[model samples]
Target: KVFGRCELAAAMKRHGLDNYRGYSLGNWVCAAKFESNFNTQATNRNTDGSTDYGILQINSRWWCNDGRTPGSRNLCNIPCSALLSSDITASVNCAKKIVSDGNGMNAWVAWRNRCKGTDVQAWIRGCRL
Candidate 1:
């Protein structure tokens, strides 16, 4: 499912992303925008044969198992197909795992390059929730 900015924010907030591990709502929203444009079915392949899945663009190399990524650890213990669904339950859960692993929001290069060290208040400004 593709979500609007505020819609994504509300979903993220409700799904345990608000202030999760020192990462704010805007941080996630901004990452979603740059990473996958809030498209839940998004996937991108890396040169090493690893792929990224879901709205957060989770990597198959270290997180989810795609059966394609060589030597995948599947750290989240979830199938990468779980992330390709429109339902974001698995997406949020895996994202929480990614952040909890001491990676913080830096797991997504989009976050580090675009959302980090900047005021992302506008990303969540329109959402009343």
Candidate 2:
């Protein structure tokens, strides 16, 4: 569901997320569902790019740009901002890094503050961390 389209999945397979790396796919989906309701193209201009768009609510200028290559645009290339889009595979991949490299809960909390606003717990339905 996160891929948004078949093309998105094909593009993601090229990167990673084919396997359960550091983060759980279910958790990633849960986060997106709670935040943006899986809207990959969702955007919020009022938040000054801090609110973001898509499933992960990724900030526009911070993570994605038309100029950046897919390699650079994907979750692995960036941090925090990666999850802000409908790229489910990429978002999950980024989640893995956040949970593994940094304290998973702490990273989740940071993002929660950015996107969820008053509904932090709402975004983490199935996410253990």
Residue pairs with backbone overlap in model 2? 40-54, 42-53, 42-54, 58-84
Off by over 4 Å in 2: 1-21, 45-49, 65-129
lDDT of every predicted structure (CA atoms): 0.90, 0.46
Question: What is candidate 1's local distance difference test score?
Answer: 0.90
Considering every candidate listed, which one attains the maximal TM-score? 1
Mark the regions of model 1 whose C-alpha exceeds 4 Å error after superposition: none
lDDT of 2 by residue, 1-129 (tens): 344333343443355533344433334444555555556555565333244545555543435443432333433465544455444555545445545654553444434555433443343344333
Residue pair clashes in candidate 1: none
lDDT of 1 by residue, 1-129 (tens): 899899999999999898999888999899999999999989998998999998999999998888988787898899999998878888899999988887788878899999998998789996889
> Measured by TM-score, how close is model 1 to the native structure?
0.96
What shift in Å separates residue 25 of candidate 2 from its native position after superposition?
Answer: 1.5
TM-score of each: 0.96, 0.41
